[PDB]
Paper text:
Here, we show that the enterobacterium [name] actively antagonizes [name] ubiquitylation through [name], a secreted effector protein with ubiquitin E3 ligase activity. To understand how [name] recognizes [name], we determined the cryogenic electron microscopy structure of the [name]–[name] complex. The specificity of the interaction is achieved through the leucine-rich repeat of [name], which binds the RING domain of [name] by hijacking the conserved RING interface required for binding to ubiquitin-charged E2 enzymes. The cryo-EM maps show that the LRR domains of [name]/2.5 interact with the RING domain of [name], whereas the unstructured N termini and the catalytic NEL domains of [name]/2.5 remain unresolved. Binding is mediated by the canonical concave substrate-binding side of the LRR, involving an extensive interaction interface spanning from strand β2 to β7. Several hydrophobic interactions (for example, [name]/2.5 F120 with [name] F3992 and [name]/2.5 V177 with [name] L4036) and hydrogen-bonded amino acid pairs (for example, [name]/2.5 K100 with [name] D4013, [name]/2.5 R215 with [name] Q4029 and [name]/2.5 R157 with [name] C4035 carbonyl O) stabilize the interface. Substitutions of key interfacial residues, including L4036E in [name] and K100A, F120E, R215A, V217E and F238D in [name] abolished or reduced binding between [name] and [name]. While WT [name] effectively degraded [name], neither [name]-F238D nor [name]-R215A;V217E did so, similarly to catalytically inactive [name]-C368A. However, the respective RING domains bind the IpaH LRR in different orientations, with Zn2+ sites I and II of the [name] RING domain aligning with sites II and I of the LUBAC RING1 domain, respectively, when the structures of the two complexes are aligned by the [name] LRR.
We recently discovered that the initial step of ubiquitin coat formation on cytosol-exposed Salmonella enterica serovar Typhimurium (Salmonella Typhimurium) is catalyzed by the E3 ligase [name], which ubiquitylates bacterial lipopolysaccharide ([name]) in the first example of ubiquitylation targeting a nonproteinaceous substrate. [name] is an example of a cytosol-dwelling Gram-negative bacterium that has evolved a plethora of mechanisms to avoid clearance by cell-autonomous immunity, including antibacterial autophagy, to establish its replicative niche in the cytosol. These adaptations include the IpaH effector proteins, a family of bacterial E3 ubiquitin ligases that are secreted into the cytosol of infected cells, where they engage the host ubiquitin–proteasome system. IpaH proteins comprise a short unstructured N terminus, a leucine-rich repeat (LRR) mediating substrate recognition, and a C-terminal so-called ‘novel E3 ligase’ (NEL) domain. Lastly, to gain molecular insights into the interaction between [name]/2.5 and [name], we determined the structures of human [name] bound to [name]/2.5 using cryo-EM.
Residue numbers in the entry:
A (entry chain B): 37 to 273
B (entry chain A): 3784 to 3843, 3854 to 4099, 4112 to 4210, 4217 to 4233
C (entry chain A): 4684 to 4758
The structure:
Amino acid sequence: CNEFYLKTWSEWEKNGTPGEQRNIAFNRLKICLQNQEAELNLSELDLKTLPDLPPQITTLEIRKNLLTHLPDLPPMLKVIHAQFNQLESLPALPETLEELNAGDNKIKELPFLPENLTHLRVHNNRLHILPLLPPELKLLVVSGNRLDSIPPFPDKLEGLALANNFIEQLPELPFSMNRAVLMNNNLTTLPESVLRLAQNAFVNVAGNPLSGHTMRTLQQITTGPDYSGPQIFFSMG
Amino acid sequence: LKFLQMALWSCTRKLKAASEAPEEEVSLPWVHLAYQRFRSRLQNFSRILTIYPQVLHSLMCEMTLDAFAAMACTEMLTRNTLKPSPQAWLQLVKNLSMPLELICSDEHMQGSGSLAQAVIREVRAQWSRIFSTALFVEHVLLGTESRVPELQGLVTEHVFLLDKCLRENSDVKTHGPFEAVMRTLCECKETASKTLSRFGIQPCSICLGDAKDPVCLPCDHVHCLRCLRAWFASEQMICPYCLTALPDEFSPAVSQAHREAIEKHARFRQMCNSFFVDLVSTICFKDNAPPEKEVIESLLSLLFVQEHTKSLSPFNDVVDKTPVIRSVILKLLLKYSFHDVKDYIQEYLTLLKKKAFITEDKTELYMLFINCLEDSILEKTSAYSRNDELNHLEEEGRFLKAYSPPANEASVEYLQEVARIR
Amino acid sequence: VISPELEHLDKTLPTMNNLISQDKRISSNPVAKIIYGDPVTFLPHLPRKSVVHCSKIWSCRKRITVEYLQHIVEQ
Ligand SMILES: [Zn+2]
Ligand SMILES: [Zn+2]
């Protein structure tokens, strides 16, 4: 089907409207297809639509394009950096997805997150609720969205970002945490467990209308140096 | 001269038909009476033709030539949109506004027959639409020209899209047209944002405003320098919005392209906001009848971001860092009779005071209301005649006789009593 | 010479008002306490329950005129 895949890409090419560096895309796609390169690129070519691209790729940059929708994603496309497309929603994430960036897209609801999603970045979408997270979610970036509630966090939530969201209360952050960012949410109160973390976790809660008594509580607890907890921040200026 | 003859002739026929008796003969005296009774209508028609003589070609028992002239004008403006040049069309619209709004005035057309009323019914939809479009030009287009000419073509296109969303029902005092204008202005702003930077424009993921002193990165997300200084504490220079792998040696700086882009989008947002404000003030809050419930509810829902306060705007991208309160919508609603708008004003007051933007010691907030209410009365009272002034003073005496007194809080009727008493 | 002085009236006038109101010649007068201070200190009949029964809600107010607009434009 490789012949049909590049053929369809040339066919979409004949649809080439102004601004679309489809020539460069077509060469990159064909070289990848014939050399069966594990990676493809489409960045900055102002594309508005994607045909089906080579299957055996495990990485891809399609950033800074103008797509509003994606075709089926290859089963092996582990690593997507699709920042700044115009996708209104995310099609099927393959089995082996290990990393995705979907910044500045127009998605409003995500498909299911596979088991191997060690990293996710979906910043600046228009989501209102998040699908379930896998146990190995070493990273979740969900900033920029409009989430009013947040599902549970898995075993290994090392990296987290939640800014610009509407989350009001946070599940328990286990010792897996090392880099938390939770600013400008609807945070009513957040647990003391954030203290139990290691001595190196960055934890910011700025911009939130948190309980003034909860902040005074966390100062009282940390200023009781008995804690070996992380470095906690509340606002800067 | 022929058309003025036809007008004064129809006026004379109408006036004589009410001669208390049959109108066997139409003598010369009635021509003066018709002129005296229909003076303003005829002078307005003359003014119209002076402004837009072409109307004559469009024209070619009752006085109707003024209304037909108005309809002709609104058509030779809806067809001649932005011709010869945006400034000449805007200026023609503006000049005609006074006579067209006179013709669309119920008092100006007292005694108008069914044909004149039927004409004016449509002339009002056309004029409201033309005025909405004229304000959109004046604020977004012309300003775009000097400040952000890269967008001048796109705003030109959206000018006509505005005319079309108002075409069918141009009474923006209703819900459909108001929501449609808002949808149009949001689509225009989004498209302008995509134009000024094909990576778009997004606010600083730290301060959630637009990135003053923009600092771009190998991931193209934008932040402020001062925000990156505060951010650079330790082990956490890697962007939050992205969790990028940082080569620790990285040290940022200002990328000019984005500061210019942001400046352009801020000028654009300021112009669109000024347009929405002017539409609300001039068109929506114009009639001698208050707008519907849904329009006012929507305005109040917009003033608050779900809370944080902002200037009167349809965009959820500008916010008063401190909870600022401003008098605009109160001044607009109070234009009408307090008895109709009191529940809107009390909903506004309670919605501010719902721990949303004010906490306690609200004596200054109430003074805002007290002054706005006082303005409404002063505004109305300065219109009164001397006999109406004496009648008003009598009514105030009767209110002072009738006035007699919960605690720990005020209400808009109580604040209105306080304003009136003051 | 004069303009520098008028520019700062928002600050300079409260100072003089205080110095006059606090003078022994005046501070023992109730009318002054009504004009400058809060009479609640010295009038017991004054209600204190409703926010509307404060001292500011019953304070003076800037009368809007053509001349005041003219001054503001000039500034
Ligand atoms: Zn910032
Ligand atoms: Zn990034």
